């Protein structure tokens, strides 16, 4: 049994465990037979080309299906009266009721609406015709081919880079900062100024005329002579670079000329930043030299050894990358609703809900994975000798202080936050809603006031943003923060207080599980030699009291539940606060979010009505029938996860042995024999499969609920506003 | 001479697992899969470009045409099979002969199956109407 070829341990297994574990360990390239360090980095570099190519093929498919089956040009002519189309439906299982429910009014056939926001992205970038979308689709498929060729080419023996090339940290940082961040942002500022801003002006600039179309009438003469204010001046032609600040009151979105100036300003910062480190020209910083100098008296050896720790551990590098991506992904979610960039996207409420929820769940997975590879680092790559007394080894040295205080904060938050919700629920039940514990969120209102929100009893400490940000942006910023129908610093009250501490509970508890798993990854009192067993192993048996879920992998598994719970609390709160805004029901949110029955009744029960009426014996089907079916599907998958999570292996293995008996004794069927002996799934596999069903069922249920409740009850809104002075 | 066309790995795996080369098959089942593949696509040129392509019996005429082409091809293959004498198992005389029998059964069957799909493809969307 030669599959899997990378593991002769697995390949000689005569059971069905050979197939499952070959799949599960296929991308764990470090643990494969015959792997060297150099061949690992060469395989990764080419694998990363393949992943890049998949991203561009995915984007070209979205572009093709919107161009070929969508209604982009019909939507461009009428952005309020036209629902954007993702792709057509051809499903032979459809009856006549389903075909007409998905066929839009006057339409040719059944289609899916689009909630990815791609139309608003394509329109804001300046695309106006289907030929724009089709040429994007071809270009990304060609770009995908180039990366596939590059990955293949850099596996050829003349082009495989050396291990010293992959470990040249200083050159990679200089190139990724200056070109991959800086020049790419500079190029995007070029697209905005040459293409997207003239398209917003109504001037079609494309490849056929952009060489002979000045983006500014004075073109490039103010740039080189240092007279840069001409690009901001309305009397010297339409401006291309401004700092108005705030949101455009006609659109409710960011100023395009602000977006262009933003990407130009940060391009200069990133290009300058990528001149910091020492490559082959004598000048620049050695990263090892910077880290070794930063050694103070309280933190022992400081950062000495951390260069060779990070540069020789891919799991450390990946954990740092995942954590930073996860923070930035959350920041994308928080700033996309608060400061939207895309024309007609704040008016599409379903898209704003879908995008916030998508990116917060992605950020939650990236955060858990960052700590997972931090735990893998400690078992596989952490050398205590080369990290002697530095800041890394000192974390492990006071790890009982870290875990016990994280345990304290989570219990401190959890006892009182739950206690306050329960207090308010009992008050509402007994007819005493004026005896609720309603705590005013004055520390966060303090933050809003420092940015120029006018809130009566809360002081501007330094004197307000007139003192603290006296820039050119200040009039447009203050006009957008104090305006009605403006998403910047939403009004908050006691319901916002309680859920923010519930969120802080979920953040501290998920961190506690992840940090304890990463810090007890190498060993504990119950298992002092745990690093000799690895990241993922079932247990150490029933001795010493019993040791189920003792591995660092099992702490990942436990924290996924807590991450899903925390992001659930975050996205429930975003959705209910915004559908109360969109639905003109903010007073209901402020009244009912302070106790948990209000969340059950006014959020979950009330907004389930269009969803579960998506198909019915009385009224047939409508467009929500697919979300209604997915909503039930998600409940089924989630509940199926419970079977794997609760009923553990030895039950199933004894059950399978009777089935093995039955097959071998049944006439006409015992002539057919398995090649691999049926066994129950392993202990770790049962946890993983149970977590997978739990997670998939969690996400599909909420996505069906979030989309169908928003698209039926709160689909559209104005998003224009009157600025405040 | 050793060339990249002669030496690609998933090109070698594909050819090695075509039914003429696939390990563990009987020559009948080899011919059956080969015939089913060829008879399926062969009705396409006969039905769409044949002389009765614009009449309502164009698919039936293309079906009987394909069966005629497979029957004459089988005559060559069955005659080849009777005369080879050369090599063991798959290039046995009985081996090639079973392949010829399987090819014709699969070929006619592939054409009939492709006929039924082309004649009754409106049924795959008949639920909606």
């Amino acid at each position: 049994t030669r599959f899997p070829k990378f593991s002769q341990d697995l390949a000689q297994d005569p059971t069905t465990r050979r197939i499952w574990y070959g799949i599960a360990t296929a991308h764990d390239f470090e643990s494969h037979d015959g792997m060297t360090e150099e061949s690992l980095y060469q395989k990764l570099f080419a694998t990363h080309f393949g992943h890049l190519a998949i991203i561009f093929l995915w984007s070209s498919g979205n572009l093709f299906h919107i161009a070929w089956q969508g209604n982009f040009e019909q939507w461009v002519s009428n952005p309020t009266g036209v629902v954007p189309i993702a792709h057509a439906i051809w499903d032979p299982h459809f009856g006549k009721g389903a075909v007409e429910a998905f066929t839009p009014e006057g339409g040719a056939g059944p289609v899916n609406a689009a909630y990815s926001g791609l139309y608003y992205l394509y329109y804001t970038l300046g695309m106006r015709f289907n030929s724009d979308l089709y040429q994007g689709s071809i270009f990304l498929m060609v770009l995908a081919t180039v990366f596939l060729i590059a990955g293949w080419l850099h596996l050829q023996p003349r082009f495989r880079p050396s291990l010293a090339w992959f470990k040249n940290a200083e050159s990679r940082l200089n190139h990724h900062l200056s070109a991959l961040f800086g020049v790419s942002s500079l190029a995007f500022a070029g697209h905005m100024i040459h293409v997207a801003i003239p398209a917003a002006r109504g001037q079609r600039v494309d490849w056929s005329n952009f060489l002979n179309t000045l983006p500014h009438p004075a073109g490039l003469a103010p740039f080189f002579t240092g007279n840069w204010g001409v690009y901001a001046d309305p009397q010297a032609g339409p401006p291309i670079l401004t700092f108005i600040g705030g949101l455009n009151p006609a659109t409710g979105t960011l100023w395009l000329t602000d977006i262009a100036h933003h990407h130009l300003a940060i391009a200069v910062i990133f290009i300058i930043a990528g001149h910091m480190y020492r490559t082959n020209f004598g000048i620049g910083h050695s990263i090892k030299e910077i880290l070794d100098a930063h050694k103070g008296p309280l933190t022992g050896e400081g950062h000495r050894g951390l260069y060779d720790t990070i540069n020789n551990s891919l799991h450390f590098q990946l954990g740092l990358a995942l954590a930073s991506l996860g923070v930035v992904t959350s920041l994308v979610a928080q700033h996309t609703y608060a400061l939207p960039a895309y024309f007609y996207m704040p008016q599409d409420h379903t898209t704003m809900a879908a995008l916030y929820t998508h990116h917060q769940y992605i950020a939650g997975f990236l955060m858990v994975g960052a700590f997972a590879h931090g735990a893998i680092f400690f078992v596989r790559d952490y050398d205590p000798k080369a990290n002697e007394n530095n800041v890394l080894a000192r974390m492990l040295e006071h790890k009982e202080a870290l875990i016990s205080h994280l345990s304290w904060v989570s219990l401190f938050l959890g006892f009182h936050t739950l206690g306050l919700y329960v207090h308010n629920d009992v008050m509402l039940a007994f007819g005493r809603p004026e005896d609720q514990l309603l705590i005013e969120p004055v520390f966060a209102q303090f933050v809003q006031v420092q940015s120029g929100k006018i809130i009566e009893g809360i002081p501007a400490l330094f004197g307000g943003p007139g003192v603290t940000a006296p820039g050119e942006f200040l009039t447009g910023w203050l006009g957008s923060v104090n305006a009605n129908n403006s998403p910047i610093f939403l009004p908050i009250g006691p319901g916002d207080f309680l859920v923010h501490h519930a969120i802080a509970l979920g953040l501290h508890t998920t961190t506690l599980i992840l940090v304890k798993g990463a810090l007890d990854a190498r060993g504990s009192k119950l298992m002092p030699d745990k690093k000799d067993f690895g990241f993922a192993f079932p247990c150490d048996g029933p001795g010493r009291g019993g040791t189920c879920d003792i591995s660092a992998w099992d702490a990942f598994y436990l924290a996924v539940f807590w991450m899903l719970n925390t992001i659930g609390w975050v996205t429930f709160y975003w959705h209910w606060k915004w559908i109360s805004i969109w639905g003109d029901n903010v007073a209901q949110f402020n009244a009912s979010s302070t106790y948990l029955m209000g969340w059950l009744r006014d959020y979950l029960w009330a907004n389930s009505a269009p969803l579960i009426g998506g198909y019915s014996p009385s009224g047939g089907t409508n467009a929500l029938s697919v979300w209604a079916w997915m909503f039930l599907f998600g409940h089924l998958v989630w509940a199926t996860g419970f079977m794997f999570l609760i009923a553990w292996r030895g039950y199933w293995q004894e059950l399978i042995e009777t089935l093995v008996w039955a097959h071998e004794r049944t006439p006409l069927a015992n002539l057919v024999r398995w090649k691999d002996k049926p066994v129950a799934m392993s202990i770790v596999q049962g946890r993983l499969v149970g977590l997978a069903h739990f997670t998939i069922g969690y996400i599909l249920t909420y996505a069906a609920f979030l989309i169908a409740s928003t698209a039926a009850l709160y689909p559209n809104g104005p998003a224009a506003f009157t600025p405040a002075i | 001479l050793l060339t990249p066309v002669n030496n690609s790995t998933a090109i070698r795996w594909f050819i090695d697992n075509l039914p003429i080369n696939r390990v563990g098959m009987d020559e009948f089942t080899r011919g059956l899969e080969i015939g089913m593949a060829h008879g399926y696509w062969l009705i396409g040129p006969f039905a769409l470009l044949g002389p009765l392509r614009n009449t309502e019996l164009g698919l039936v005429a293309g079906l009987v045409s394909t069966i005629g082409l497979l029957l004459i091809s089988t005559i060559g293959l069955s005659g080849y099979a009777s005369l080879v004498e050369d090599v063991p198992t798959e290039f046995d005389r009985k081996g090639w002969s079973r392949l010829a029998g399987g090819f014709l059964v699969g070929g006619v069957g592939g054409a009939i199956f492709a006929f039924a799909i082309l004649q009754f493809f409106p049924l795959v969307s008949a639920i909606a109407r």
Binding site: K43, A46, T47, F49, G50, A53, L57, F64, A67, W68, N130, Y134, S137, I138, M141, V142, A144, T145, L148, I149, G151, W152, L155, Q156 | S8, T9, A10
Partner: peptide
């Protein structure tokens, strides 16, 4: 619109990406 010629062109570009993916996936294995 996306005409029938442009659908056919897109599948030819997709076929070339397919053989490129085939080159990479066998060099990776």
């Amino acid at each position: 619109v996306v005409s029938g010629a442009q659908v056919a062109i897109a599948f030819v570009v997709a076929l070339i990406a397919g053989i490129a993916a085939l080159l990479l996936s066998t060099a990776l294995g």
